[PDB]
Structures are given as structure tokens and as C-alpha cells.
Design a binder for this molecule. Structure first.
Ligand SMILES: Cc1n/c(=N/[C@@H]2CCC[C@H]2CO)s[nH]1
Ligand SMILES: [Zn+2]
Ligand SMILES: [Zn+2]
Ligand SMILES: [Zn+2]
Length: 459
């Protein structure tokens, strides 16, 4: 039970308006054959074009919703829609393109998937709400065979060229015309009552239906992401490193210790209510403060209602001391809070678009995060950048230029001039901070927070 068997049954009901008379009894084997593909009994790493739901989830970075609308059938033109927003009209002779024959349409398909996926995945997974034309049109831009490697590198082959009879990964596909060994999954195989728009609209208001194929491709993938990452949560599934994952997470841990440590020095809160991940550790283990923990798993549907986290009768007096919501998404934060809230709008290779305004943040694990809402922070202010250090001014051990900054809160800066050690740490902390901000995180703090109260901790 690692791969999807070709002898598995395929429910064909959703395919009988474009394919009238299609048999009720159908396996993937007969379906791939009907699509115009010969599998030849190949034990070379590609057992089925279609994949399991578990395999689709392990490869979410590769998802591209795909839908074809019969615009007028190898007589009528076909509008090919993709969840990237692209609409290509192929003739059999929001980005809507005019009718062009398959030989040029296929070149555009390879460019679009290559530029979209080269930094995300080693493959493409076509997410469908299959009715007929998308499966039958796959023979016009897809070639299948044994698993292969790139002609220019050691990555897996995702594209083929008829002009040169060579294979390439997403990075080296310039000029390639065919999609090689793609994967696909039909959402309509998961047991849905009603059409695509009806099932999608139950959970999302962001994606409308402007009746173009790309609208259905977007709603398809959005619904597939809700089923796999909103209503079903699997935090065990590990995901390959494709970017700045380790630096972003190290930066987040440094910023948390910094922001919280300074807050406890500046306003000397007797108690700290730490609301969030049930596996949390005290980020400032030397602080005098009464550290109280409360468990709240990363919500993936709607942000927590502050009235349910705190009320119905815990320390109970959350109003006493300070509240820390580190990556804990609530609808309206209290005034006495330190908050790290991820911005689902951020454009990055880690953050994939999600359902109902949310985003799927993929960094080691997959976390669907609810839509950003500036109203959550009405009782708070944006946390300003600062670097605080009580460590001794001692070098031990990178050519220097004197650091001069009003945001370097150290004994040396108070006393007149920043020492080398603290200037190395400042520039390092500023990089880790900038790294965290770029990854999409936001930092918010109680309105009375003032970095001025930190200079007095050097009496
Ligand atoms: C218009 C739009 N942009 C999107 N970008 C996705 C990011 C991962 C590849 C793309 C797969 O759809 S989704 N909707
Ligand atoms: Zn390559
Ligand atoms: Zn949606
Ligand atoms: Zn110093």
C-alpha cells in the first residue's frame, strides 16, 4: 500500500456528459488506455499516472489545478485552465489567451509549469474535478515512459523535447514541448455530492466563478487543500527543504527569546500566560516570571475566538501579567499581549495559496493558516526593531566598520560606543529579524512597550 494500483476502480459517473456511454466498471488501467497512453507493463518507477490521496499530500507543492472546458472535441476549440490563473485556447486545426494549435499550446504549458514549479517540486500533480475533456486532452501535451533524469543535471525528468529527443527537469526545460511523466488526482473520486462550485462554496468565499476554466482549476485545488489540510490535519508528514527553512526557523527562535526577554525586563510582569502549541518550551528560561502554559494546536480553519480560549471558567486572570501568542491565531488579541502572527499574503516558495483567504505554509510540516486580519491587533501596536544584550563586552575570536545605531540597546552604546562583539551580534540579529519578516511573520506588542525602559537595566 505505497502506490495506487492501476486495477483500482474509477467512478466514471462524473465523466459521462463529455463521454456518454462510458462503462460504470472501470479501472485506472482501462482509463489510462482510453486516454491514449500505453503503459507497456513497465517496472521503471512510474506505475500509474494517477496517485493516492496520501501521495498527493506528500507532494502538495506540485499541485496545479487543471480543467478543460469544451469552448464550442477535435472539432471545437478547448479552453485549458490552470490554477496559476492561465487560460490557453487550443484549436485542433484571468489571463485569457487566443486560439492556437496544440503544437504551440504545449510549449506554453511546459514554460508555465517549469517557471511555477522549478523551485517548489520535482514533479507536477494535476488536481482535477474530472468530466472528460481534461483527461482526453492530456495526450496532446503529455508523454509517458520510464523514470528518467535530466540531460543537463541529476534531477528527475519532468519535460521532453521532440526537437532534440532529450529530457529535462523544471530548471533545464527551455524550449521543451512535452510534459513528461506527470501525476494526477481526481477529487471527484473522494465521494462528493453535488458539483464543484457547490462543494467549494461551502468552505470558501475568495474564489468566484467567472465561468472560465481557470476558475474551476482554482476552486478544484482550493477544495483539495481544504479536504487535505483544513478538515484533515497531518503534522507527521515531513517536507523537503527547498529554501531558507532552517534559517527562518532559527531566526524565529532568536526573535522570540529577544522580544520576550526584553518585555519581562522592561515591564517586570509577574506572570506570563503562554497560549499556543502544546509542545512549547519557555523561550526565556532564566526569567523570574511565573510561566503558565495553555494548549491550543495550530488552527487551520478559522482563527480562535478569544472568548473560547479564555472564558467558560487556568490562571483565569489573563488580564494579570502578559499574554504570549507565538503563532497562535486568535480573532482579537488582548491589550496585554506579545504576538507573532504569520501573514498569509506573503509571496514566498514556502507559502502556497490556500482556502478562504488562508495559506498553506510549508516549512518541514504543512500548516494551513487562516486569512490575515489587521483587526486582530486593534488593542496592540507594531513591534519596533531593537537588539538588547546584557552579555559582557568581550570580543573572543570578519573586518569591522564602527557600528552606530540608536536600536542597539547595550552597556557599550549607553556608555558611548558599541564594542565589536555587540556590533557583530547586532548585525546578526538584524539579519535573523529581516529573515523572519521576509518569511511573512508579523510582530505585535502591548501599546505601553517602550525600548527606553531597557537602558535602566544597566544600573
Ligand atoms: C492565481 C493563483 N496563484 C496561485 N499560485 C499557486 C502557488 C503554487 C503554484 C500555483 C498553483 O495554483 S493559486 N491561485
Ligand atoms: Zn536539470
Ligand atoms: Zn477557494
Ligand atoms: Zn558591548
Amino acid at each position: 500500500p505505497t502506490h495506487l494500483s492501476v486495477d483500482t476502480k474509477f467512478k466514471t459517473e462524473g465523466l459521462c456528459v463529455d463521454i456518454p456511454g462510458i462503462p460504470k466498471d472501470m479501472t485506472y488501467r482501462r482509463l489510462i488506455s482510453m486516454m491514449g497512453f500505453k503503459m507497456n507493463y513497465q517496472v521503471n518507477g512510474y506505475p500509474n499516472m494517477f496517485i493516492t490521496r496520501e501521495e498527493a499530500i506528500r507532494h502538495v507543492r506540485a499541485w496545479i489545478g487543471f480543467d478543460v472546458e469544451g469552448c464550442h472535441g477535435t472539432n471545437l476549440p478547448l479552453q485549458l485552465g490552470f490554477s496559476t490563473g492561465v487560460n490557453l485556447v487550443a484549436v485542433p486545426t484571468p489571463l485569457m489567451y487566443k486560439g492556437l494549435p496544440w503544437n504551440v499550446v504545449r510549449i506554453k504549458i511546459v514554460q508555465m509549469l517549469s517557471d511555477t514549479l522549478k523551485n517548489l517540486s520535482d514533479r507536477v500533480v494535476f488536481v482535477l474535478w474530472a468530466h472528460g475533456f481534461e483527461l482526453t486532452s492530456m495526450k496532446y501535451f503529455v508523454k509517458i515512459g520510464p523514470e528518467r533524469t535530466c540531460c543537463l543535471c541529476d534531477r528527475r525528468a519532468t519535460c521532453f523535447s521532440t526537437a532534440s529527443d532529450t529530457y529535462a527537469c523544471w530548471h533545464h526545460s527551455i524550449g521543451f514541448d512535452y510534459v513528461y511523466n506527470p501525476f494526477m488526482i481526481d477529487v471527484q473520486q473522494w465521494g462528493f455530492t453535488g458539483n464543484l462550485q457547490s462543494n467549494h462554496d461551502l468552505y470558501c468565499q475568495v474564489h468566484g466563478n467567472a465561468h472560465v476554466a481557470s476558475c474551476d482549476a482554482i476552486m478544484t485545488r482550493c477544495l483539495a487543500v481544504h479536504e487535505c489540510f483544513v478538515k484533515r490535519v497531518d503534522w507527521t508528514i515531513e517536507y523537503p527543504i527547498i529554501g531558507d527553512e532552517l534559517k527562518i526557523n532559527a531566526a524565529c527562535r532568536k526573535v522570540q527569546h529577544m522580544v520576550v526577554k526584553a518585555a519581562l525586563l522592561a515591564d517586570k510582569f509577574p506572570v506570563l500566560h503562554d497560549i499556543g502549541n502544546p509542545k512549547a518550551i519557555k523561550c526565556v528560561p532564566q526569567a523570574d516570571v511565573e510561566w503558565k502554559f495553555y494548549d491550543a494546536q495550530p488552527c487551520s480553519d478559522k482563527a480562535y475566538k478569544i472568548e473560547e480560549l479564555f472564558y467558560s471558567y487556568h490562571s483565569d486572570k489573563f488580564t494579570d501579567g502578559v499574554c504570549l501568542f507565538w503563532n497562535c491565531n486568535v480573532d482579537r488579541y488582548p491589550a496585554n499581549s506579545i504576538v507573532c502572527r504569520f501573514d498569509t499574503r506573503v509571496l514566498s516558495n514556502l507559502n502556497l495559496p490556500g482556502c478562504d483567504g488562508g495559506s498553506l505554509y510549508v516549512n518541514k510540516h504543512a500548516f494551513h493558516t487562516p486569512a490575515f486580519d489587521k483587526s486582530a491587533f486593534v488593542n496592540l501596536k507594531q513591534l519596533p526593531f531593537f537588539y538588547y544584550s546584557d552579555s559582557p563586552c568581550e570580543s573572543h575570536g570578519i573586518d569591522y566598520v564602527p557600528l552606530k545605531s540608536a536600536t542597539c540597546i547595550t552597556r557599550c552604546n549607553l556608555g558611548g560606543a558599541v564594542c565589536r562583539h555587540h556590533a557583530n551580534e547586532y548585525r546578526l540579529y538584524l539579519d535573523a529579524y529581516n529573515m523572519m519578516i521576509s518569511a511573512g511573520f508579523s510582530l505585535w506588542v502591548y501599546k505601553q512597550f517602550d525600548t527606553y525602559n531597557l537602558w535602566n537595566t544597566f544600573t
